[PDB]
């Protein structure tokens, strides 16, 4: 829309208070004119028809249950683009300022959240498995990093690659929650998942076996289901970057700990300038090693604890 910036307030999915970049021009709209060429959330009206309409308001006040999930899906887009233009110094998931847009309500009962190839798609859940997907910060840059895969590395969804596509939406769907301080952990999606169950969450990265997912590349999954366990195997690099980061000892093999930037610096690298498509752990596993001794030499503790880690999991 061709208007004012301004600025509105108001809740998001989780009831906290929050001001959001919008658009005046007869109606306020969510659009954002501060970052990049623009961030942009659109009503799904509950179908499935997208995008839908380009959210408007008559006060700039988004206070309403209904408004919740649009607050949060437009603000969370600001925050992970702040980060990856902050951190990596990379505009919008193109790396050229690309507009971001986002539709909520889609459908009904819908328990789930995706980046369809040109968008953001937020289900509202059913009320007990999921409330509103856009009200996880995790759950949103993981699902925006996709779009930052699909233009660099070009992951494909399947098998090892699509494992390693599905981990890295998780590592920094978890280092935009640490980035924006906000309650951070290495789970996912704990803000929205379940909201009569306490502590659970989708996956944990710093145990993974928590839930169910593989910690170690002997007990990967080698059928058929889930595009041959994307999202089952990434627990084995999930557990491999907590490792880099946090460090610890695991099946014997203990990790030093670097920390969460040179985690995120490493993958980074690696995302962008050595993984291929069809890309599977072992070369992952190259990639990040040759990622931090790009970074910080050879003979460094880095790329000690890189290595260290992918032992630890098995991925030689
Ligand atoms: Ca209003
Ligand atoms: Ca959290
Ligand atoms: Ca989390
Ligand atoms: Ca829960
Ligand atoms: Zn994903």
Same mark, same amino acid.
Do not use: C
């Given at each position: ?5 301004? #600025?509105? #307030? ?16 007869? $109606? ?75 539709? #909520? ?34 759950? #949103? ?49 704990? *803000? ?49 970057? $907590? ?67 992918? *032992? ?5």
């Amino acid at each position: 829309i061709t208007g004012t910036s301004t #600025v509105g #307030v108001g809740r998001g999915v989780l009831g906290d208070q929050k001001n959001i970049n919008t658009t005046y021009s007869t $109606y306020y709209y969510l659009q954002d004119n501060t970052r990049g060429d623009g961030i942009f959330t659109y009503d799904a009206k509950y179908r499935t028809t997208l995008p839908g309409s380009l959210w408007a308001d008559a006060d700039n006040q988004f206070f309403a249950s209904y408004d919740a999930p649009a607050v949060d899906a437009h603000y969370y887009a600001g925050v992970t683009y702040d980060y990856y233009k902050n951190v990596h110094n990379r505009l919008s998931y193109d790396g050229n300022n690309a507009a971001i847009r986002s539709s #909520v309500h889609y459908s009904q009962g819908y328990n789930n959240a995706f980046w369809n190839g040109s968008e953001m798609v937020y289900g509202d859940g059913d009320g007990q498995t999921f409330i509103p997907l856009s009200g996880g910060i995790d759950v #949103v840059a993981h699902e925006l990093t996709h779009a930052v895969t699909d233009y660099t590395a070009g992951l494909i969804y399947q098998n090892e690659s699509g494992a390693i596509n599905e981990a890295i939406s998780d590592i920094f769907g978890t280092l935009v929650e640490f980035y924006a301080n906000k309650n951070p952990d290495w789970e996912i999606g704990e *803000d929205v998942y379940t909201p009569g169950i306490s502590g659970d969450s989708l996956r944990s990265m710093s145990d993974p076996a928590k839930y169910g997912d593989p910690d170690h590349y002997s007990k990967r999954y080698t059928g058929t289901q889930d595009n041959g366990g994307v999202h089952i195997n990434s627990g084995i690099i999930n557990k491999a970057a $907590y490792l880099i980061s946090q460090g610890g000892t695991h099946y014997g093999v203990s990790v030093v700990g670097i920390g969460r930037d040179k985690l995120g610096k490493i993958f980074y690298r690696a995302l962008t300038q050595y993984l291929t498509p069809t890309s599977n752990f072992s070369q992952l596993r190259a990639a990040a090693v040759q990622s931090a001794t790009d970074l910080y030499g050879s003979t460094s503790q880095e790329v000690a604890s890189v290595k260290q880690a992918f *032992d630890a999991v098995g991925v030689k």
